[PDB]
Design an enzyme around this catalytic site. Structure first.
Site, PDB file in Angstrom:
ATOM      1  N   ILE A  86       0.820  -1.220   0.000  1.00 37.72           N
ATOM      2  CA  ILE A  86       0.000   0.000   0.000  1.00 37.72           C
ATOM      3  C   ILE A  86       0.856   1.273   0.000  1.00 37.72           C
ATOM      4  CG2 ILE A  86      -1.623   1.402   1.413  1.00 37.72           C
ATOM      5  CD1 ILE A  86      -2.881  -1.018  -0.243  1.00 37.72           C
ATOM      6  N   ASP A 139      -6.746  38.818 -23.904  1.00 43.01           N
ATOM      7  CA  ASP A 139      -7.092  40.192 -24.179  1.00 43.01           C
ATOM      8  C   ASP A 139      -5.816  41.037 -24.376  1.00 43.01           C
ATOM      9  OD1 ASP A 139      -8.703  42.790 -23.774  1.00 43.01           O
ATOM     10  OD2 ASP A 139      -7.204  42.798 -22.159  1.00 43.01           O
ATOM     11  N   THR A 163      -5.483  45.044 -24.247  1.00 40.71           N
ATOM     12  CA  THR A 163      -5.296  46.270 -23.476  1.00 40.71           C
ATOM     13  C   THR A 163      -5.268  46.033 -21.969  1.00 40.71           C
ATOM     14  OG1 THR A 163      -6.814  47.151 -25.171  1.00 40.71           O
ATOM     15  CG2 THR A 163      -5.882  48.710 -23.581  1.00 40.71           C
ATOM     16  N   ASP A 185     -10.277  46.332 -29.664  1.00 42.34           N
ATOM     17  CA  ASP A 185      -9.577  47.399 -30.378  1.00 42.34           C
ATOM     18  C   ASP A 185      -9.504  47.116 -31.888  1.00 42.34           C
ATOM     19  OD1 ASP A 185      -8.159  49.781 -30.803  1.00 42.34           O
ATOM     20  OD2 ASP A 185      -6.485  49.230 -29.503  1.00 42.34           O
ATOM     21  N   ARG A 189     -11.869  44.019 -32.811  1.00 45.23           N
ATOM     22  CA  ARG A 189     -13.208  44.627 -32.767  1.00 45.23           C
ATOM     23  C   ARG A 189     -14.256  43.556 -32.429  1.00 45.23           C
ATOM     24  NH1 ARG A 189     -11.730  50.329 -33.718  1.00 45.23           N
ATOM     25  NH2 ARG A 189     -11.537  50.054 -31.468  1.00 45.23           N
ATOM     26  N   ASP A 202      -8.176  41.627 -18.005  1.00 43.35           N
ATOM     27  CA  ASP A 202      -8.253  42.637 -16.950  1.00 43.35           C
ATOM     28  C   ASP A 202      -9.659  43.228 -16.868  1.00 43.35           C
ATOM     29  OD1 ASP A 202      -7.719  43.684 -19.635  1.00 43.35           O
ATOM     30  OD2 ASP A 202      -7.646  45.659 -18.706  1.00 43.35           O
ATOM     31  N   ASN A 249     -15.202  42.880 -19.741  1.00 46.75           N
ATOM     32  CA  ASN A 249     -15.473  42.228 -21.019  1.00 46.75           C
ATOM     33  C   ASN A 249     -14.817  40.848 -21.142  1.00 46.75           C
ATOM     34  OD1 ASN A 249     -13.102  43.993 -21.250  1.00 46.75           O
ATOM     35  ND2 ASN A 249     -13.107  43.515 -23.453  1.00 46.75           N
ATOM     36  N   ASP A 250     -13.869  40.560 -20.247  1.00 41.81           N
ATOM     37  CA  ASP A 250     -13.144  39.282 -20.226  1.00 41.81           C
ATOM     38  C   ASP A 250     -13.753  38.235 -19.275  1.00 41.81           C
ATOM     39  OD1 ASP A 250     -11.220  40.469 -21.994  1.00 41.81           O
ATOM     40  OD2 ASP A 250     -10.178  41.333 -20.264  1.00 41.81           O
ATOM     41  N   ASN A 287       7.286  -2.238  -4.689  1.00 42.28           N
ATOM     42  CA  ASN A 287       6.338  -3.032  -3.902  1.00 42.28           C
ATOM     43  C   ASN A 287       5.822  -4.286  -4.602  1.00 42.28           C
ATOM     44  OD1 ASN A 287       6.781  -0.995  -2.067  1.00 42.28           O
ATOM     45  ND2 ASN A 287       4.628  -0.392  -1.861  1.00 42.28           N
ATOM     46  N   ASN A 338       8.897  -1.775   4.519  1.00 38.60           N
ATOM     47  CA  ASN A 338       7.934  -0.715   4.239  1.00 38.60           C
ATOM     48  C   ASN A 338       8.378   0.648   4.770  1.00 38.60           C
ATOM     49  OD1 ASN A 338       5.224   0.240   3.323  1.00 38.60           O
ATOM     50  ND2 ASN A 338       4.953   0.574   5.526  1.00 38.60           N
TER      51      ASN A 338
HETATM   52  N1  LIG Z   1     -14.681  54.885 -22.121  1.00 36.11           N
HETATM   53  C1  LIG Z   1     -14.830  54.775 -23.458  1.00 36.11           C
HETATM   54  N2  LIG Z   1     -15.620  55.617 -24.158  1.00 36.11           N
HETATM   55  C2  LIG Z   1     -15.776  55.513 -25.494  1.00 36.11           C
HETATM   56  N3  LIG Z   1     -15.154  54.573 -26.227  1.00 36.11           N
HETATM   57  C3  LIG Z   1     -14.328  53.668 -25.651  1.00 36.11           C
HETATM   58  C4  LIG Z   1     -14.116  53.717 -24.198  1.00 36.11           C
HETATM   59  N4  LIG Z   1     -13.267  52.716 -23.882  1.00 36.11           N
HETATM   60  C5  LIG Z   1     -12.969  52.073 -25.037  1.00 36.11           C
HETATM   61  N5  LIG Z   1     -13.596  52.645 -26.089  1.00 36.11           N
HETATM   62  C6  LIG Z   1     -13.514  52.209 -27.501  1.00 36.11           C
HETATM   63  O1  LIG Z   1     -14.276  51.008 -27.613  1.00 36.11           O
HETATM   64  C7  LIG Z   1     -13.468  49.950 -28.114  1.00 36.11           C
HETATM   65  C8  LIG Z   1     -13.899  48.633 -27.475  1.00 36.11           C
HETATM   66  O2  LIG Z   1     -13.554  48.578 -26.090  1.00 36.11           O
HETATM   67  P1  LIG Z   1     -13.241  47.166 -25.401  1.00 36.11           P
HETATM   68  O3  LIG Z   1     -14.287  46.191 -25.892  1.00 36.11           O
HETATM   69  O4  LIG Z   1     -13.014  47.377 -23.927  1.00 36.11           O
HETATM   70  O5  LIG Z   1     -11.837  46.724 -26.083  1.00 36.11           O
HETATM   71  P2  LIG Z   1     -10.383  47.353 -25.737  1.00 36.11           P
HETATM   72  O6  LIG Z   1     -10.511  48.343 -24.599  1.00 36.11           O
HETATM   73  O7  LIG Z   1      -9.603  46.122 -25.370  1.00 36.11           O
HETATM   74  O8  LIG Z   1     -10.054  48.020 -27.051  1.00 36.11           O
HETATM   75  C9  LIG Z   1     -12.031  50.376 -27.828  1.00 36.11           C
HETATM   76  O9  LIG Z   1     -11.119  49.867 -28.798  1.00 36.11           O
HETATM   77  C10 LIG Z   1     -12.080  51.878 -27.902  1.00 36.11           C
HETATM   78  O10 LIG Z   1     -11.863  52.291 -29.251  1.00 36.11           O
HETATM   79  F1  ALF Z   2      -7.908  44.318 -25.681  1.00 37.73           F
HETATM   80 AL1  ALF Z   2      -9.299  44.372 -24.549  1.00 37.73          AL
HETATM   81  F2  ALF Z   2     -10.678  44.330 -23.409  1.00 37.73           F
HETATM   82  F3  ALF Z   2      -8.340  45.228 -23.302  1.00 37.73           F
HETATM   83  F4  ALF Z   2     -10.310  43.566 -25.774  1.00 37.73           F
HETATM   84 CA   LIG Z   3       3.708   0.649   1.707  1.00 37.03          CA
HETATM   85 CA   LIG Z   4       8.772  -0.582  -0.852  1.00 35.94          CA
HETATM   86 MG   LIG Z   5      -8.286  44.810 -21.339  1.00 34.85          MG
HETATM   87 MG   LIG Z   6     -10.475  47.558 -22.618  1.00 37.67          MG
END
Ligand SMILES: Nc1ncnc2c1ncn2[C@@H]1O[C@H](COP(=O)(O)OP(=O)(O)O)[C@@H](O)[C@H]1O
Ligand code: ALF
Ligand SMILES: [Ca+2]
Ligand SMILES: [Ca+2]
Ligand SMILES: [Mg+2]
Ligand SMILES: [Mg+2]
Ligand SMILES: CCCCCCCCCCCCCCCCCC(=O)OC[C@H](COP(=O)([O-])OCC[N+](C)(C)C)OC(=O)CCCCCCCCCCCCCCCCC
Ligand SMILES: CCCCCCCCCCCCCCCCCC(=O)OC[C@H](COP(=O)([O-])OCC[N+](C)(C)C)OC(=O)CCCCCCCCCCCCCCCCC
EC number: 7.2.2.10
Length: 994
Positions: free
Chosen positions: A307, A351, A353, A627, A678, A703, A706-707, A768, A796
């Site tokens: 064992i 992600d 940013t 983005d 996007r 971070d 959205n994640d 064993n 053992n």
């Molecule tokens: N506070 C905000 N107000 C307006 N537009 C924003 C803001 N934050 C981000 N964005 C635009 O919206 C897009 C999508 O945001 P998001 O989904 O968080 O992706 P990421 O921040 O990773 O680009 C960004 O690429 C940016 O162009």
């Molecule tokens: F690149 Al990100 F939320 F920061 F899509």
């Molecule tokens: Ca044993």
């Molecule tokens: Ca043994």
């Molecule tokens: Mg981010």
């Molecule tokens: Mg972001």
């Protein structure tokens, strides 16, 4: 404040004596901290280590031996007079192996708990407050929050205390309070009082509870209660119910533990049944029932021998070790399966940013329209210095510092930036540096407007704290902010509804200020602004706008771009419905294009290296971001996801291009593409889901809120320590360091923990099994007993103890991070490896009987020399035909049995030297690679020498000391097991597959 939910907003402010937008005075705080104490709960400690020790004896394999010690103790009352001292040592040999492993387990557990608590306490939790101290919101330690001060919270934040909501800045405020109320989905909050002072927390729709998360929106509130008075504090000081559970690999090994327990149990009764013709022998002299007690004792001892006692402890030890090793690299392990799961990881999704990049934003480029003349369009481009969030820098036009107020387009650009903003900037006095409040993108805008001194405000005579928001505050006084249409990721813009201050601009009327992703924003522009004038959006103008975006996005600075626009004639305020955010886009239409900012956000320095290291380990990295595709692709090149010149048409998609693909094609594009841009929160988890449908083990890293969904879907989710609390909640591991490399380190540890388990099983099975085939071989050949019950227990204790446990401290193989990840389909024990076990086991069993036979036969100086008469040893009493004339009791000699015990101990100490690696050579992976093993071997080897030479011990263990020529025989017969496995490692490495 009790029943703050029952009282109105006006009543709560008057109750503490606080102006809503001002907050507490420094004197008010001083008194409140004295009156209420700090916003914290009594600390957790680790005094007495029993709950620990008790857990050390909870597994089945350990409790089997715990039972065996009791039978040995009850059977000690059945022992008569003569050999009593031998019978009482037995249970101490069983119990000593259990305690030794418990000490290691408990010791390793405490060190893990301390390293975890040293990392969790390191970085103090912060809160946003309004205090009379400063005009803007300021960052303070969460523990310094008192009932009374005005606290600010927003999407992604953790609610720091129990808050009575005073004002919801967004169209909706949603909260994740599952940790308290139990409800899964986010819940809507309002500002109206709830009359019932006895109402349950679910009905308190105007409260925010400490340690919960803002899923959506932004809110201002007043603190009702803090500390132990909190709604979550009442169930922390008492209801400390653990979320503890055993990992998949733990359950896999425990399932394997029961599998052996049955197999051993079967070949255990198979010893009592093949020795029924010995219950009435001259050796024992006893009756048919007395001889049955002895072979029951052989069985129980062989069970204990076979064992694996260490198995339950060694996995818990290796896991505790893993958590400690991660804590040293600043990684908070929230769930125990984390490390072992990262070993299996074949795809890391990430992600961009704030995860792949530093999230240290700064606007370094902006442009407004300069001139529109039919087919001709030109821009006024600008440059901005300073990379931090410090309001220290210059606006440059053709290398010359310019006055931003000069350009009417820049005046409006600054106005949008300041007004369409849910973030601010706060100066940390202690650190001496400007820190962001809220989102990084947005704060870069805040610090941009401070640098742009658009109304030439006197700033040089202000303190560092005042200077942080001075010029932003000036713009805020120009237009009243009615309400905001918050940032949404479907729209990828954000809107602000503003009326004039009723002084200068008063004559015009209402405006909407708009900021967002250039693609969507520019499409909803029907006009462009030229100074203070406005002209229709045309093809040439739009093409020009976009071309410079592309330039800055795909360039070497790989700039994050954002367009800015205004609605010159917004809809009637009463014709806009704020309940559904799907309507917000239409309210942000018929826009006038104002300008574009481009912000730098440098990639984290360790990322490029980590990806290459992941590539070596056979792990894919996939960027998933919202983005722009161009900048995303450009960044992928900068971090090595794509080559500098690699074609990426097949390998990079926008969310739209992805959605345009048939479902079957989307799935396929996931195992092909490495960049998604996007994208949406739904897209991120969908991609992870597609990856998982090919039965890949997938990680998500991020971070942002959205994640969270993708972090929850992935096998393991890794959050950034500088990211949101929401993303941390969705995660199994937090990088408090934000060090991307730690992910790779965690992958290495996960493979190490698995490989160490494999070599632990290698050692215990191969050894064993040999102990079993030793007892069966003697019966099969008809030779005298090689061992007694007490002698089996010693084998053992000395072989299954620390030498086995020390294998859990083996270093990683030299090619651990150069082999592709292990399949989930792959079984625990390979068919080849199960043959490996029987080949070593068969040899150590044949070597043990061979050494005992050698003593009876070839051993010249050793007493008793015979030829081919061992087979028939139960004869000389009745029939001695070929017997030389020696003693008819020399078969009860301790000397050949001591040789057997000695070889069995020595050969397994040699067999442990093989278990440093699976396939790698012993010369290539030298014995001194694990010092803990060598220390354990010598402790076992020394302890075995004590049992032979220290006067009372050889009598108790029924042994006689060996000659220096007899020890050389042990060495001559044991050492070859190193060479045997060496040949088997040569076959597995060269002939089979390395
Ligand atoms: N506070 C905000 N107000 C307006 N537009 C924003 C803001 N934050 C981000 N964005 C635009 O919206 C897009 C999508 O945001 P998001 O989904 O968080 O992706 P990421 O921040 O990773 O680009 C960004 O690429 C940016 O162009
Ligand atoms: F690149 Al990100 F939320 F920061 F899509
Ligand atoms: Ca044993
Ligand atoms: Ca043994
Ligand atoms: Mg981010
Ligand atoms: Mg972001
Ligand atoms: C009637 C009574 C009968 C008396 C007979 C009793 C004889 C039994 C003798 C000794 C019991 C063995 C207990 C040792 C437990 C060690 C726990 C530990 O420190 O684990 C962490 C240690 C340290 O690991 P670590 O992880 O903390 O170290 C960090 C370094 N890296 C990262 C590289 C690993 O790990 C060990 O478990 C590794 C296995 C090796 C075993 C070490 C033993 C050293 C050898 C001999 C010294 C023994 C004498 C001490 C006697 C103590 C008696 C209580
Ligand atoms: C009670 C006495 C026992 C006598 C039984 C007689 C057994 C024969 C003994 C020796 C002959 C050895 C030749 C056989 C090898 C052929 C098998 C084989 O194909 O192996 C490769 C296969 C191949 O495995 P694979 O599919 O993973 O392939 C891996 C190969 N590479 C690495 C190259 C990719 O291994 C099998 O998985 C082994 C079968 C598993 C059996 C489970 C083990 C249970 C252990 C003990 C139970 C006790 C049995 C008692 C019997 C009671 C009967 C009622």
């Amino acid at each position: 404040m009790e029943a703050a939910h029952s009282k109105s907003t006006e009543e709560c402010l008057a109750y503490f004596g606080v102006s809503e937008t001002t907050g507490l005075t420094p004197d008010q705080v001083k008194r409140h901290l004295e009156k209420y104490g700090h916003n914290e709960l009594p600390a957790e400690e680790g005094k007495s280590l029993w709950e620990l020790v008790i857990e050390q004896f909870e597994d089945l394999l350990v409790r089997i031996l715990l039972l065996a010690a009791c039978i040995s103790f009850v059977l000690a009352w059945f022992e008569e007079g003569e050999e009593t001292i031998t019978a009482f040592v037995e249970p101490f040999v069983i119990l000593l192996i259990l305690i030794a492993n418990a000490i290691v387990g408990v010791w390793q557990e405490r060190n893990a708990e301390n390293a975890i608590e040293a990392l969790k306490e390191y970085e103090p939790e912060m809160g946003k407050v309004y205090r009379a101290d400063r005009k803007s919101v300021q960052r303070i330690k969460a523990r310094d929050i008192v009932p009374g001060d005005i606290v600010e919270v927003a999407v992604g934040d953790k609610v720091p205390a129990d808050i009575r909501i005073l004002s919801i800045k967004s169209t909706t405020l949603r909260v994740d309070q599952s940790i308290l109320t139990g409800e899964s989905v986010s819940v809507i909050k309002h500002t109206e009082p709830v009359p019932d002072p006895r109402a349950v927390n679910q009905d308190k729709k105007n409260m925010l509870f400490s340690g919960t998360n803002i899923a959506a929106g932004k809110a201002l509130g007043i603190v009702a209660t803090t500390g132990v008075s909190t709604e979550i504090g009442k169930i922390r000081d008492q209801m400390a119910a653990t979320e503890q559970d055993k990992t998949p690999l733990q359950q896999k090994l425990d399932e394997f533990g029961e599998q052996l327990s049955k197999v051993i149990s079967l070949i255990c009764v198979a010893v009592w049944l093949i020795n029924i013709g010995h219950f009435n022998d001259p050796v024992h002299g006893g009756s048919w029932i007395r001889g049955a007690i002895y072979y029951f004792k052989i069985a129980v001892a062989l069970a204990v021998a076979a064992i694996p006692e260490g198995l339950p402890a060694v996995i818990t030890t290796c896991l505790a070790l893993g958590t400690r090793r991660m804590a040293k690299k600043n990684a908070i392990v929230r769930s125990l399966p984390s490390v072992e799961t990262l070993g299996c990881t074949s795809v890391i999704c990430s992600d961009k940013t704030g995860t792949l990049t530093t999230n240290q934003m700064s606007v370094c480029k902006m442009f407004i329209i300069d001139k529109v003349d039919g087919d001709f369009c030109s821009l006024n481009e600008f440059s901005i210095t300073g990379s931090t969030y410090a309001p220290e820098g210059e606006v440059l036009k053709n290398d010359k510092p310019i006055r931003s107020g000069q350009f009417d387009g820049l005046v409006e650009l600054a106005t949008i930036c300041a007004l369409c903003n849910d973030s601010s900037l706060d100066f940390n006095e202690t650190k001496g540096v400007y820190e962001k409040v809220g989102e990084a993108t947005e704060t870069a805008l805040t610090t941009l407007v401070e640098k742009m001194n658009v109304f030439n405000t006197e700033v040089r005579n202000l303190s560092k704290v005042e200077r942080a928001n001075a010029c932003n505050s000036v713009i805020r006084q120009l237009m009243k902010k009615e309400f905001t249409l918050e940032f949404s990721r479907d729209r990828k813009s954000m809107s602000v509804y503003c009326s004039p201050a009723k002084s200068s601009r008063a004559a015009v009327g209402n405006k909407m200020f708009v900021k967002g992703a250039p693609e969507g924003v520019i499409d909803r522009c029907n006009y462009v602004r030229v100074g203070t004038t406005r002209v229709p959006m045309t093809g040439p103008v739009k093409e020009k706008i976009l071309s410079v975006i592309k330039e800055w996005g795909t360039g070497r600075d790989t700039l994050r771009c954002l367009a800015l626009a205004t609605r010159d004639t917004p809809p009637k305020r009463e014709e806009m419905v704020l309940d559904d955010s799907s309507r917000f886009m239409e309210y942000e239409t018929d826009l006038t294009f104002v300008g574009v900012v481009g912000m730098l956000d440098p990639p984290r320095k360790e990322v490029m290296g980590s990806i290459q290291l992941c590539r070596d380990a056979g792990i894919r990295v996939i960027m998933i971001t919202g983005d722009n595709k161009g900048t995303a692709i450009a960044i992928c090149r900068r971090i090595g996801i794509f080559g500098e010149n690699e074609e990426v048409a097949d390998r990079a998609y926008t969310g739209r291009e992805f959605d345009d693909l048939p479902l079957a094609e989307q799935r396929e594009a996931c195992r092909r593409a490495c960049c998604f841009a996007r994208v949406e929160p739904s897209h991120k988890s969908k991609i992870v889901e597609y990856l998982q449908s090919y039965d890949e083990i997938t990680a998500m890293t991020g971070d942002g809120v959205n994640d969270a969904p993708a972090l929850k879907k992935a096998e393991i989710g890794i959050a950034m320590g500088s990211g949101t609390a929401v993303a941390k909640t969705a995660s199994e591991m937090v990088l408090a360091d934000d060090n991307f490399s730690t992910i790779v380190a965690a992958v290495e540890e996960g493979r190490a923990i698995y490989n160490n388990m494999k070599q632990f099983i290698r050692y215990l099975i191969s050894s064993n099994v040999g102990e079993v085939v030793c007892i069966f071989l003697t019966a099969a050949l008809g030779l005298p007993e090689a061992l007694i019950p007490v002698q089996l227990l010693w084998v053992n204790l000395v072989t299954d103890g620390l030498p086995a446990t020390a294998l859990g401290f083996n270093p990683p193989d030299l090619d651990i991070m150069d082999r592709p990840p292990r399949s989930p389909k792959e079984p625990l024990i390979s068919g080849w490896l199960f043959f490996r076990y029987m080949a070593i086991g068969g040899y150590v069993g044949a070597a043990t009987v061979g050494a005992a036979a050698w003593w009876f036969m070839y051993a010249e100086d050793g007493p008793g020399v015979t030829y081919h008469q061992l087979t028939h040893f139960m004869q000389c009493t009745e029939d001695h035909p070929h017997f030389e004339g020696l003693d008819c009791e020399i078969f009860e000699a301790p000397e050949p049995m001591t040789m057997a015990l000695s070889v069995l101990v020595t050969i397994e100490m040699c067999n442990a030297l093989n278990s440093l690696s699976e396939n790698q050579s012993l010369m290539r992976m030298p014995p001194w690679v694990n010092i803990w093993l060598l220390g354990s071997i010598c402790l076992s080897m020394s302890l075995h020498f004590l049992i032979l030479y220290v006067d009372p011990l050889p009598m108790i263990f029924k042994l006689k000391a060996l000659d220096l020529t007899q020890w050389l025989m042990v060495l001559k017969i044991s050492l070859p097991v190193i060479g045997l496995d060496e040949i088997l490692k040569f076959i597995a490495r060269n002939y089979l597959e390395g």
